[PDB]
Design a protein around this ligand. Structure first.
Ligand SMILES: COC(=O)c1oc2cnccc2c1NC1C=CC2=C(NO)C=CC2=C1
Length: 262
């Protein structure tokens, strides 16, 4: 039944980037797979935990919208094998190669991302690092939520304010996730990273912390539905108790999706 993979089966190839606690590669193991290696030399008990944690979460996820966990390896190095997705992460599409999607497609990307988050939360899984970087578009039409290195049961532009100013011990909640999703909604509807005009990172944390800065919602493109812009605002609420839980968030996007194509 177990998911550990025998030493030598996984064939590591190209290095393609990084992920939480590791280095991501494209590999081969019964086909193409993404591999995240949690070290070079010998494992810290720091790393040893984040590994056991992450695998322990992935193996609780079986959904079309969550990146498929396939196996893990310790023996050469700590490594996490998942399926592989041709075509890059939502971030790359939006801010690097500046793919211009149609509104129906953007909403759909939103509807899937929503779908998967609902899944995770229904399983008491908190992602704590949702961001268009970890949202992967497989075969260009299917959304996979990736990288659970920080999930439980670095990048600030998605952090809710309650997270940005550390108090108390536990800022992370289902709602801190919603807010992150709120920003990728913003990305989707604006094709832009928020606070793009401010070139100081530390100001942006301070200001979003103290509630002086918020995403500028007038940047949403004209053919974005009013219901979407309205839902976006709801998720980006500064007070966390005023934000919608994903079941409600899902129903909202599905509704406005059905009354769109006309
Ligand atoms: C910069 O990253 C990429 O370009 C990247 O492309 C991919 C294509 N398919 C799957 C995963 C990735 C992935 N990244 C991963 C992120 C997290 C991962 C894991 N988290 O456990 C396991 C394999 C992972 C790949």
């Amino acid at each position: 039944d177990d998911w550990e993979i025998p030493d030598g089966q996984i064939t590591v190839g190209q290095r393609i980037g990084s992920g939480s606690f590791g280095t991501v590669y494209k590999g081969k193991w019964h086909g193409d797979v993404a591999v995240k290696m949690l070290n070079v030399t010998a494992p810290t008990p720091q790393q040893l935990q984040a590994f056991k944690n992450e695998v322990g979460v992935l193996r609780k996820t079986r959904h079309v919208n969550i990146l498929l966990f396939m196996g893990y390896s310790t023996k050469p190095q700590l490594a996490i094998v998942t399926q592989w997705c041709e075509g890059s992460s939502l971030y790359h599409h939006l801010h690097i190669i500046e793919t211009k999607f149609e509104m129906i497609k953007l909403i759909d990307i939103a509807r899937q991302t929503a779908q998967g988050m609902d899944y995770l939360h229904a399983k008491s899984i908190i992602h704590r690092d949702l961001k268009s970087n970890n949202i992967f578009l497989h075969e260009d039409l299917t959304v996979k939520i990736g990288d659970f290195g920080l999930a439980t049961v670095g990048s600030i532009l998605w952090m809710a304010p309650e997270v940005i100013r550390m108090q108390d011990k536990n800022p992370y909640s289902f709602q801190s996730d919603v807010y992150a999703f709120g920003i990728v909604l913003y990305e989707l509807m604006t094709g832009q990273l928020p606070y793009s005009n401010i070139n100081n990172r530390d100001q942006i944390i301070f200001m979003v912390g103290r509630g002086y800065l918020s995403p500028d919602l007038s940047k949403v493109r004209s053919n974005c539905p009013k219901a979407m812009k309205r839902l976006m605002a709801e998720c980006l609420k500064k007070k966390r108790d005023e934000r919608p839980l994903f079941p409600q968030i899902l129903a909202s996007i599905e509704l406005l999706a059905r009354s769109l194509p006309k």
